[PDB]
Paper text:
One such T6SS effector is [name] from Salmonella Typhimurium. [name] functions as an LD-carboxypeptidase to cleave tetrapeptide stems and as an LD-transpeptidase to exchange the terminal D-alanine of a tetrapeptide stem with a noncanonical D-amino acid. Our structural data revealed that [name] possesses a unique LD-transpeptidase fold consisting of a dual pocket active site with a capping subdomain. This includes an exchange pocket to bind a D-amino acid for exchange and a catalytic pocket to position the D-alanine of a tetrapeptide stem for cleavage.
To probe the molecular features of [name] that may contribute to this activity, we soaked [name] crystals with D-Ala and D-Met. We were able to obtain cocrystal structures of [name] in complex with each amino acid. The interaction of both D-amino acids with [name] is facilitated by a salt bridge between the D-amino acid carboxylic acid and the sidechain of R115. Interestingly, the hydrophobic sidechain of D-Met faces toward the solvent and has no significant interaction with the active site of [name]. Although the His-tag is an artifact, binding of the known D-Met substrate to [name] induces a drastic conformational change in the His-tag. Compared to the native and D-Ala–bound structures, the His-tag in the D-Met–bound structure has significantly shifted its position within the [name] active site. This change also includes the ability to model five His-tag residues instead of four and the loss of two ordered sulfates. Additionally, the binding of D-Met and the reordering of the His-tag induces a conformational change in the [name] capping subdomain relative to both the sulfate and D-Ala–bound structures. Given the observed His-tag peptide bound in the active site of [name] and that both the artifact and the capping subdomain change conformation upon binding of D-Met, we hypothesize that like YcbB the capping subdomain of [name] stabilizes a peptide stem for transpeptidase exchange activity and potentially for crosslinking.
Residue numbers in the entry:
A (entry chain B): 702 to 706
B (entry chain A): 2 to 175
Write the structure that this text describes.
């Protein structure tokens, strides 16, 4: 994923 | 309407209207020469904006405070509605618009290893590999688009003409 949040 | 925004690391320009303060990259990564480092200044090139308003952003994992991806203009759960995720989602802000690389040079930037780009209206003075913009941008976007009837096409060209820090002073002041 490009982001974790 | 057809709008080609431009972003130079410090200002997001809407031709014919005005300029918005804008910032890209985490605090130590706000540099054009770091644009292929994860979470740094967004890579130069051409991106499509997804401005279709789709309401609240999907939540991929509430337990991990992880928003899902979405291709549109969505809102961020905040305050009590965000629970313990507030501190993390304050880094999103209240609004986000998805970006997608729109041509060959942009898709191939950085070996194709970066992505997940958005324009968003947090007031941190940094961005996790996206573009943080002055919140009024989203008020102008709503007002300008809701008075037109036909198709609405938005893009942004990212081009760094200076090596200066890619911080437009978006941190909340006074
Ligand atoms: C896992 S892709 C790298 C992280 C993403 N936020 C970016 O800046 O491109």
């Amino acid at each position: 994923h490009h982001h974790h949040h | 309407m057809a709008v080609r925004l431009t972003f130079d690391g410090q200002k997001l320009t809407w031709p014919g209207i005005g300029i918005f303060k804008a910032t890209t990259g985490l605090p130590d990564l706000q540099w054009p020469d770091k644009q292929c480092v994860p979470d740094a200044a967004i890579p130069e090139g051409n991106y499509k904006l997804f401005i279709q308003f789709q309401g609240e952003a999907p939540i991929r994992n509430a337990a991990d405070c992880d928003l899902g991806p979405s291709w549109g203009w969505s809102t961020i759960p905040r305050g009590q509605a965000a629970g313990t995720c507030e501190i993390y989602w304050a880094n999103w802000g209240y609004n986000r618009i998805r970006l997608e690389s729109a041509d060959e040079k942009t898709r191939k930037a950085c070996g194709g290893k970066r992505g997940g780009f958005y324009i968003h209206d947090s007031t941190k003075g940094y961005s996790h590999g996206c573009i943080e913009v002055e919140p009024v941008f989203f008020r102008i976007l709503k007002q300008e688009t809701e008075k037109e009837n036909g198709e609405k096409t938005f893009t942004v060209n990212v081009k760094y003409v200076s090596g200066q820090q890619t911080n437009g002073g978006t941190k909340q002041g006074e």
